[PDB]
């Protein structure tokens, strides 16, 4: 699978029939149809910068992985009773500034989206176990609006020159990804999925109402990551965003 024509979002259901399921992500959040849920607690994140581990070029994207053996780095509050353990963050982006985000709000596409992913360590013993469970994953989604250069993206963008091609990886340490989150943690939530294969309907989404900035040049740095292995013809990682999917009767709840 990929984001090509022959292997991309439109083809994904041929090998992953859950692509056409009832809890697929991302979605369009229509704000006139969201329901204020007054029992939603505020989102609490507390991450320890010492859990940052490694950055990796995964061919379709890049991941920043965190040590997840303990509860040094956790998400709590919002719709959860369970504590969730940070394991990774990554971005999605598009061909052009005009699209790029995965989630859309009242039909508006943003230019990129940051996903900060966590697994349910109160109920499960590992990511591998958690990943396929309905209440297994918690992902903060932050919409990225093209404008001012974001200095907080800094260390991440500077690390990419070490992981230019597919499979390359390098240490990436002493980083607290709560520094990338918007100042307000007001959010939408709904039950959904991973936005790429294997597309498990295991994710409770926490979508921030407030966007963060990214410059047009910052976005070019993403798209200049290569999806080929070192030595092969250069293939820019131009886009990795999936089209929005049918709510199929789910409700988007709002914290605000
Ligand atoms: Zn993602």
Curated annotation (Swiss-Prot):
Positions annotated as active site in the UniProt record: 60
Outcome following mutation: residue 63 to R: In variant Michigan-1; confers enhanced esterase activity and an additional zinc binding site
EC number in record: 4.2.1.1, 4.2.1.69
Residues involved in Zn(2+) 1 binding: 90, 92, 115
Cofactor(s) demanded: Zn(2+)
Reaction equation(s) it catalyzes: hydrogencarbonate + H(+) = CO2 + H2O; urea = cyanamide + H2O
Alphabetical UniProt keywords: Acetylation, Cytoplasm, Lyase, Metal-binding, Zinc
UniProt keyword annotation of Kinase present: no
Region of interest (Disordered), ranges: 1-26, 236-256
Protein family (similarity comment): Belongs to the alpha-carbonic anhydrase family.
Record's protein name: Carbonic anhydrase 1
Source species: Homo sapiens (Human)
Gene (name only): CA1
């Amino acid at each position: 699978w990929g984001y090509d024509d022959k292997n991309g979002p439109e083809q994904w259901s041929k090998l992953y029939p859950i692509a056409n399921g009832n809890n697929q992500s991302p979605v369009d959040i229509k704000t006139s149809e969201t329901k204020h849920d007054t029992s939603l607690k505020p989102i609490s994140v507390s991450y320890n910068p010492a859990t940052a581990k490694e950055i990796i070029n995964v061919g379709h994207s890049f991941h920043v992985n965190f040590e997840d053996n303990d509860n040094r780095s956790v998400l709590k509050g919002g719709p959860f009773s369970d504590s969730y353990r940070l394991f990774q963050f990554h971005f999605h982006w598009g061909s052009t500034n005009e699209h790029g985000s995965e989630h859309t709000v009242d039909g508006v596409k943003y230019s990129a989206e940051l996903h900060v992913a966590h697994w349910n360590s109160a109920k499960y013993s590992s990511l591998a176990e958690a990943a396929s469970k309905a209440d297994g994953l918690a992902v903060i989604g932050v919409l990225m609006k093209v404008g001012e250069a974001n200095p907080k993206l800094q260390k991440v963008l500077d690390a990419l020159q070490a992981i230019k091609t597919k499979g390359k990886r390098a240490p990436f340490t002493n980083f607290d990804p709560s520094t990338l989150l918007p100042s307000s943690l007001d959010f939408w939530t709904y039950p959904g999925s991973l936005t790429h294969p294997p597309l498990y309907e295991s994710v409770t989404w926490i979508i921030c109402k407030e966007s963060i900035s990214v410059s047009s040049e910052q976005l070019a740095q993403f798209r200049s990551l290569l999806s080929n292995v070192e030595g092969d013809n250069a293939v820019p990682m131009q886009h990795n965003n999936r089209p929005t999917q049918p709510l199929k009767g789910r409700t988007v709840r709002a914290s605000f």
